[PDB]
Symmetry: C7
Subunit: 265 residues, 7 copies
């Protein structure tokens, strides 16, 4: 499991730590330029207004190119989703395949202690391969949780890949106070080309989540092709190669890996 669970534990934890590293250096999020201390609380009001009138005006006030993109106000808010959607199919395996594979773990531990007392009497296990010869289409439910994550990883390497072509000059947006003008239509300056503060490290942290998950998307497929390279097809390996690894994974003893020493000597 380590070849899969190492990734499935470390990399969502990598993403939540990489979100929390940006959460260290928040401070504020936008800094609006009020007309050079014509007030102080009107400055905070303009800041709040433009921080909430990012998305509701669907007309052309930003004009930097395809402004319906919500000005990426949501990278912790999206990154938490993209962490938990990778975290969850491990929980689905743990809540749909873990007790059955735990009973099968007891079965294969009974197989190895039956091998041990067979060697004791030598100083039946051959029927257990018949117990794992059968149809057993339920193991493909277990392999789905790996391949379901690989869909979300693939679109993660697409969604962040949109962000770099996006972020040329998708920060310096103009913002009006138009209902604020519609208070009076009288005195307030009409628009304030404010600036988001986080676009500099939203970009150069979306390098790291992208290029790591680029360096990992073929790696999960490599676990799924050892079933192709081990003498039987993917519709036959389900009780062998998901069992051949786990037999040596949990526990062995003084006869398991001393078979081949005694097989060679």
């Amino acid at each position: 499991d380590k070849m899969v669970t190492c990734i499935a534990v470390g990399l969502p934890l990598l993403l939540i730590s990489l979100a929390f590293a940006q959460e260290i250096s928040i401070g504020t999020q936008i800094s609006c330029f009020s007309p050079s201390s014509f007030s102080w609380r009107q400055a905070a009001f303009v800041d709040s207004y433009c921080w909430a009138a990012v998305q509701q005006k669907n007309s052309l006030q930003s004009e930097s190119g395809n402004l319906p993109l919500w000005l990426h106000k949501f990278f912790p808010y999206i990154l938490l989703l993209f962490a938990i959607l990778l975290y969850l199919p491990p929980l689905f395996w743990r809540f749909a395949a873990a007790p059955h594979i735990c009973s099968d773990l007891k079965f294969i531990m009974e197989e190895l202690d039956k091998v041990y007392n067979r060697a004791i009497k030598a100083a039946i296990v051959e029927q257990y391969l018949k117990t794992k010869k059968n149809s057993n289409n339920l193991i493909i439910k277990y392999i789905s949780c790996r391949l379901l994550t690989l869909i979300i990883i693939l679109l993660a390497c697409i969604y962040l890949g949109y962000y770099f072509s996006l972020s040329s000059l998708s920060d310096e947006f103009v913002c009006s106070i138009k209902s604020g003008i519609l208070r009076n239509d009288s005195t307030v300056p009409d628009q304030f080309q404010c600036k988001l503060i986080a676009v500099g490290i939203f970009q150069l942290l979306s390098v790291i989540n992208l290029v790591v998950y680029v360096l990992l998307a073929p790696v999960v497929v490599y676990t799924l092709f050892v079933p192709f390279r081990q003498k039987t097809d993917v519709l036959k390996v389900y009780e062998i190669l998901p069992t051949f690894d786990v037999l040596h994974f949990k526990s062995e003893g003084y006869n398991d890996l001393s078979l081949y020493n005694l097989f060679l000597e």
Copy 2:
């Protein structure tokens, strides 16, 4: 239980984490526009006044359409209720059906070890189906706690569904200081069309709670129709299908899932 308790544990925890994610980015809640630094503490007083004169004036000062809606000042305050009302029927099951099903768990574990020593002597359990043949109308009390949650989930997908048709322009409300005018009737500007800061992420977080619970409301009903598809009606299954799952849920051994291996070989 995992097909139900997975949802019943994760999804209220999902909702409290999704409330705490908004609790990260609070800052302030309203930003009132005082007349361009004619004071600083009058600005904070106008902010406080309008943040508490949201609901008490039942007259038409907002006029954006059906202003008796309390301007949704309560989404953590409502979301905590909608989390605990889903959390509580699990506690009602745990405080009304858990010791009786624990004694029944000891009974079915005695059934499986009686099967085990029956196989030992083969190297009485048939009366236990008569023990679960009887009337036992108390198991419908256990199935009520699932279906009680599905009522609250259904109205959760209605209450949030009101919010999106609500939130067209139900933020930019005018607010007067009228008792504040009734201090003097003299000098203060008469109304301040302030703006709530949280309407931008109250909307686009009520997507996520809605569409997930939309994607889950038929799923709980699927657990309640396996009783329809298993040879006896819902007024007969109560001691079979709430027992057929739990027999394999808690613990098995070297004879339970090796029955069918020995039944086939």
Copy 3:
């Protein structure tokens, strides 16, 4: 105990969590309107003065109707009392009836294992009903701690019920600085009709504590009338129905709930 202790544990914890939810959104408590930045520290002094001259002036400066009500400055301060006064008779039961009922729990566990070895020899308990036939007026001390809570719950549904008829316009109070005038009698504006900030959510959170405890006051009485409906009066049930529940509450075995299976088959 679960039919009582579920309420007695959850609902004071409900009230302390419901107080802490208001403790999340404190910020400040009053916002006094100083004369439009004629100072900044005089504004904070007027705020502090009026926040402490709420109650000490017993004369008519508020005039909104029966101003000796302390302007409800104490809802966490009162709600903590109304939580601990419901928490404490469980502690009084635990410090006056728990070791005696623990010894009686050992006695009834001896009764059930005597039933078990009686069935073993069948493959004296009849004297124990004589041990619980006697006068035993001390069990009414145990039933007092339930009914003492129901007094405090009843006045809780009265005290909060005063608050809604109270809170029509019992916020906008006028406040003078009269000893502050008696510093000089010269220059300071004479009164400031300030405004408490918490009256909007003190009201609509006293809905929830009221209507839940309205939905719970008859429920505790239902536990006290099963003694009426079980063949003997309230001055006879004390060693039967406080013992009939606890025999099945703590632990049973393979003979207790298999009596009726063997009684029917």
Copy 4:
């Protein structure tokens, strides 16, 4: 011990929680009225000066009536003392009588298991009343720690009782900056009738500590008069009634409280 240790554990913890509840709502402590923003840091300096020139000027600058009372700057500072002075004689009992009463607890547990094996042989304890017949004047050291607390409780109901007659108008004190005048004797306004902010809740929290400890001072004496009402005087009960309770307090068994069942049947 529960009739004493319940009070001795809960009520000092009550007082430290009741101090921490005021520690929640500190904010600031005094708010001095500088001359209407003639500075900002001179305002904080006047605030600090008057907050430290409360007590050092023993002359008549407050004139509200017997101003040597330190203007009660110390209610957490005094309340911590009045909590730990009630907490400490339990520690004195635990460090002067607990190992000896633990050995006596082993002795009386040997007495009850000797009763148990006496009933086993029936299917010497009479000498142990001679072991507790003797002079044993050291048990009066144990009863002193109860009565030492009752002295501190009695003066606690006197010291707080001074505070309510004190606090008529012992807040609005005049404060000069006289060494501050003695800097220059030139320009600063000569006195500032500042105001402590905490006098409103120092009063109406000294209700609760008073009236609870009023409701508890006769209750501790009731434990000391059961020795008067149990057939022997206070200079004879010391090895009976401090032992009659503890025999049933720690542990009993299937023969102790089944004596009277077998004594009656």
Copy 5:
């Protein structure tokens, strides 16, 4: 040990809690009076300068009487030392006498179980008084750690006793900015008679540490004179009275304190 370790554990913990109680109410430490808002950052600079030019100017700028006293800037800083210097000789006992007295504790526990099996055979210990008859001058190393603390306690009751005669008017000190004048020699006002904020509670908390340690200095000597009153001198008691207490301190049994019951009956 309780007659010593009760003090040695509680009273340094008393002093660190009594320092932390002042650490609750820090706020700031000095408040310098800049010339009535002639700046704001010059006010903070004057505050910082005078808070660091307390001690470095050894000339007469304070003139309140013997100004080389560092204006007591160090009461948490000194009180931590006076707590740890009392804490440390317990650690010196624990690191120089605890394993040897633990082996002696095993020896005296062997003495009492040898007494127990001597009573069993009655139904050699007399040589052990010869084992503790010898010279053993190393026990005076153990008694030094008590008397070393009593030196530090005695000077603690002297050092705080200096502070009350000190603190008449050793707060209102004049402070110049002379190198600050030596920037320009031009415009800044030449001296600022600032005021430390903590002198009011540094005084009336040095009551409590003084009068408690006054009430404790003869008490430690009382433990050292029970060796004088127990039939042998201080150069003979070292293996008797440091052993007579510990024999009953750790553990006894059904024969130790039932000796005198059987000795009397």
Copy 6:
């Protein structure tokens, strides 16, 4: 393992603690010089703008020499990577070689207890050197995780070595507000030669990470040359010297290191 794991545990923890020590003294990060209080919120806006227009302008506004270096805004952000890239090959060893070496640890513990019972019978192990004589090319996978870290350590001593030649005057950068000018092209001063605050301790903390890792890069190679100095080449030692250390590393007994005592006597 201690000769490697001591470094591999302490030194990434050294780097994260050395990053957190700079995280103690953050305060702010840049301090832009607005035109001498021509506003306050324009000052914060200029600060935010220049803190995010560090990298996006790739033209010559800094001109201090090769300004595409991102002005080292990322030393915690880079140092976390350089800590976890050294932390991770220990995890790769733990997830790829730890269970196999744990089974081999059980094998060599069986070898030493076989030696022990061989000495018991003296009052087969010679075949185990044949079990570790074989080809076993998988141990070179274990030695890769040491040498993979030494690549990252080597470039760490290069990347920090760039920083000292970098940081001559790569702090005082000019920053314009050009889109801010492109708001109006009217009134705002055109550029602000701001200054990063952290360049003084980014330099003199990159001493410590450099010179320690300079003092450690040859040390890891010394572990890899004991295989050269122990009678067999690196393609033969893999089952001897990775086993000769671990035999004495985990546990020995009364015969292992008493071999040579009995071999010499």
Copy 7:
């Protein structure tokens, strides 16, 4: 070990607590004197500039005497190093001598239980002194970690000893804004003789670390001269005196320290 490990545990912990005590009272670190509120953000910029232009200007702007001393900006930053460099040779002992001395601890515990069963049979150990008679030059590696710390302690008493002769007037430094002048060469005042705030307690806390480590440097050497005073030289004691202490250090029994009682009687 207590004579060494007491120091090696307490005194680096003393230094980290003594650094954290200064970390309590940080506030700010420098307070620059801008020209008397000619701005507010220019004041913070001058403060930041001079706090980072301490060290980079190597020319004569401070002129207080040998200004290349970095104005001691690093006392927590240096004190952490001087704590961990004393902490680390205990870890080097624990990772280079602790398992070997643990096996030797098992060997000497086997020696004492062999003495115990030798006394049992009396109701071979003489060969073990031959086992510790041999060459064993590896124990000098263990004594190096004590003497390596004594080098760092000695230079600690030199480095702090530089600081007191340093700190006469090495605080009041002049600071220009010269690149800040090189923005304009026009209007800003040219230099600001600012002042570090921490020089007053950096001095009088470097008393305590100095004079304690002065009082400890000969004490570690005293442990290294008991090998000189115990009948064999330093090149012979290595298996006796590092073993004579540890035999009584860990555990003894009823025969070890009762040897001399039975040797004398």
